[PDB]
Amino acid sequence: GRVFAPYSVFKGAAALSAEPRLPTFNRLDSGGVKLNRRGVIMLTFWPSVGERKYDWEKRQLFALSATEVGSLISMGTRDSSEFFHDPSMLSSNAGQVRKSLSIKPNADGSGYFISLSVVNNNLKTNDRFTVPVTTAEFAVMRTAFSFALPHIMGWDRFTNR
Amino acid sequence: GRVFAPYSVFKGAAALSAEPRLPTFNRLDSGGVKLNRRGVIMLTFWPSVGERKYDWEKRQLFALSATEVGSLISMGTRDSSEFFHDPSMLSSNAGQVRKSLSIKPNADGSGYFISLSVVNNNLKTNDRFTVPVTTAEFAVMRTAFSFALPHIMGWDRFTNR
Amino acid sequence: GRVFAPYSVFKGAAALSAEPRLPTFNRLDSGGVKLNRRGVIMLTFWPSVGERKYDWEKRQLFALSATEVGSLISMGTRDSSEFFHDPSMLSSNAGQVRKSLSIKPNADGSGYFISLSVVNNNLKTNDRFTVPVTTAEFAVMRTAFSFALPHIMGWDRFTNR
Amino acid sequence: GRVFAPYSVFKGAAALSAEPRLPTFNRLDSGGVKLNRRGVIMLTFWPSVGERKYDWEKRQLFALSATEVGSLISMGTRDSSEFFHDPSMLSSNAGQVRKSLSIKPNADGSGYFISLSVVNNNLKTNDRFTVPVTTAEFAVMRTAFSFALPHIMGWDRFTNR
């Protein structure tokens, strides 16, 4: 069933990985199949301990929706994006936990910094994992994300077979 | 058999969705299969009643042909398109019903307005559903539509398997 | 076995269609499969007789190789290409028959003219089928051809399945 | 099992070919499958002996990683790349053998030169295979490599099926 093949970037302070998560479908009794739980592109950040040694137990995740992916793949050399996620957004527990993912270009255009910030007011913690990403590394993402977008949207269920 | 996974945009005045409809094939007796009923990318518009509440019963559709899709995916930030459809085009009942879909950019380049106008002289009605679409949302469409184009054209039947 | 789903453009003087032809493989005894007869993108031109009536019996073909496809999909608004094919190229019967396909832009950038010229010195004939192609129509080709390129190259045989 | 369909360029001094090599997976007992041995795009160079006659026995290989592919597909007309590979990189036998692949544009922008240099201090040899590649030929590579990137990354294992 399960499948694992993330694209990973391992840098000085932290490690970064990315993988699609396909949407789930509830087969209706009326016939065929219907899309249920949304697909995303999952990003995982985690800290470096030893030199090129990382603590997988301190990992934090950030799910990119289809639209956030569209925003990413349409970034030029000089562009930035910032996405803001509250796992408990739109309720009383909103504000307790805030995740913000930012993607900023270097002044020289030699790549980007992809940073995940996690503020937890419940646990009283404040984490920031930053991973530099080269122009070529980021090209791999745009291309792979672009490939995966239709799949996470469930559009690959439309083939003439 | 059937498959449902539209990409949807829900805004103030109306909701917008899009999904490929694959072409149909009549298997000839001579052998193989032949393309019959054309594929399109189907757009569905429908009105907002309550706040983020929409009336699916007042929905109107607009089928984009392969060529109209090509026109869409090749739109720059500052481009516009207008497509004109008469469900009874090229007969006496032509003019009775007119659908026009327009896609116009915002002055600031923060996205587009995608509007469906429906004029029915038979029922004496005049409807206009407008849905704003962000740069990123529109990027999702171009990419998904681009992915689907070969499939709606029936070209995916050409794989080495 | 066979599969038919060309993309077609029907204009004043002639009709134009395009479809991939997949490569053939000779399964070696040593194991697996090996690519044999090359894939191409086949273009078919044929004359208009009545208004929107065409003579399929007077059709002429032009096979685009992978590299010619690469040349096509990488054409800008103002670009041209000309391809020259001798069905009996590189022998004594070379020169007997010459096919040249040209793709030229309109001055206004509203599209292209795609023209097939066929000179037969054996039969003493000289044919020229010209078909105007809009910006959007040509966008459909670039996208569909681009999709098909890996398939006609046989690269789709490399999937993780 | 095996599959062969390289894209090949045959020129004056040497021949060049390219083909994806898919990644390998070790099916875990816990369930599903996990990516193991990395995918690459394999380049093979080999010398010309007679006119359009080549010595396959003197071939040298250069494996492009996913990231090197990303660097390639994101090359403009005026760009260059150089990749440096030591088959025994990061050990005592490092430096014994060095492979460098370069891709340089022509002054006129009529294409590129793709050159593999192999220095072997063990055997005391110094080889350089150079193959000119046209704009259109290089367009075929970018497109085919781009198609294959997700497959060599193992992302095609994520389809809704």
Helices (H), strands (E): how many in chain B? 2, 11
Mutation target to probe the D interface, by most D beta carbons within 10 A, among C24, C103, C156, C158 is: C158
The 3-state DSSP composition of chain A as helix, strand, coil percent (nearest 5) reads 20, 40, 35
Q: How far is A120 from chain D (nearest CA, A)?
A: 33
Between chains, do A150 and B151 touch, taking CB under 8 Å as contact? no
User: What gap in Å lies between CA A73 and CA A77, rounded to an integer?
Assistant: 11
Sign of the alpha-carbon dihedral angle for A82, A83, A88, A92: positive
Q: After which residues is chain A broken (C to N over 2.5 A)?
A: none
Biggest distance spanned by C-alpha atoms of chain D:
57
> Which amino acid type is present at position C71?
S
CB B20 within 8 A of CB B152: yes
CB B8 within 8 A of CB B17: yes
User: What gap in Å lies between CA D136 and CA D138, rounded to an integer?
Assistant: 5
Q: What distances in angstroms separate CA B47 from CA B51, B57, B97, B98, D46, one per listed residue?
A: 11, 9, 19, 19, 65
Of D112, B5, D54, B105, give the one whose Cα is nearest residue A27.
B5
CB B140 within 8 A of CB A70: yes
Pairing relation of β-strands B33-35 and C3-4? parallel
Q: How far is A23 from chain B (nearest CA, A)?
A: 10
Pick from A67, A73, A155: CB nearest B5:
A155
Sequence-distant (≥ 6) Cβ neighbours of residue C117 within 8 angstroms: C98, C99, C100, C101, C102, C126, C127, C128
Between chains, do B136 and A67 touch, taking CB under 8 Å as contact? yes
Between chains, do D3 and C157 touch, taking CB under 8 Å as contact? yes
At residue D117, φ and ψ (nearest 5 deg) are: -110, 135
Q: Read off the tokens for B70.
A: 């090509």
Q: How far is A62 from chain D (nearest CA, A)?
A: 19
Between chains, do B158 and C144 touch, taking CB under 8 Å as contact? no
A157 contact residues in D (CB cutoff 8 A): 160
User: What gap in Å lies between CA C66 and CA C72, rounded to an integer?
Assistant: 10
Count chain B–chain C contacts defined by CB atoms under 8 A: 76
Mutation target to probe the B interface, by most B beta carbons within 10 A, among C141, C142, C143, C151 is: C143
Q: How far is C59 from chain D (nearest CA, A)?
A: 28
Of A97, A135, A140, A141, give the one whose Cα is nearest residue A119.
A97
Q: Read off the tokens for B66.
A: 């392969």
> Which amino acid type is present at position B141?
M
Q: Read off the tokens for D66.
A: 């996913």
Which residue on chain B is closest to C35 by alpha carbon?
A: B160
B153 contact residues in C (CB cutoff 8 A): 5, 7, 140, 144
Q: B160: left (phi > 0), else alpha (psi -120 to 50), else beta? A: alpha
Between chains, do D25 and C154 touch, taking CB under 8 Å as contact? no
First to last CA, chain A: 22
> Which amino acid type is present at position C106?
N
Topology of domain A1-161 in CATH is: Transcriptional Co-activator pc4; Chain A (2.30.31)
Q: Is A156 helix (H, G, I), strand (E, B) or coil?
A: helix
Chains that touch C (3 or more CB pairs under 8 A): B, D
- Per residue in C2-34, is it b (16+ CB within 10 Å) or e — as a string? ebebbbebebeebbbbbbbebbebeeeeeeebe
Strand-by-strand arrangement of the B7-10 sheet: B7-10, B14-21, B40-47, B60-64
Of B39, B49, B64, give the one whose Cα is nearest residue B129.
B49
Give the residues across from B35 on adjacent strands: B25
* Resolution given for this structure, in angstroms: 2.3
Interface list for chain C against chain B, based on CB atoms closer than 8 Å: 1-5, 7, 19-20, 22-23, 25, 134-140, 143-144, 147-148, 151, 154, 156-157
C32 contact residues in D (CB cutoff 8 A): 1-4
B156 contact residues in A (CB cutoff 8 A): 159-160
CB B113 within 8 A of CB B103: yes
Pick from D74, D150, D160: CB nearest A147:
D150
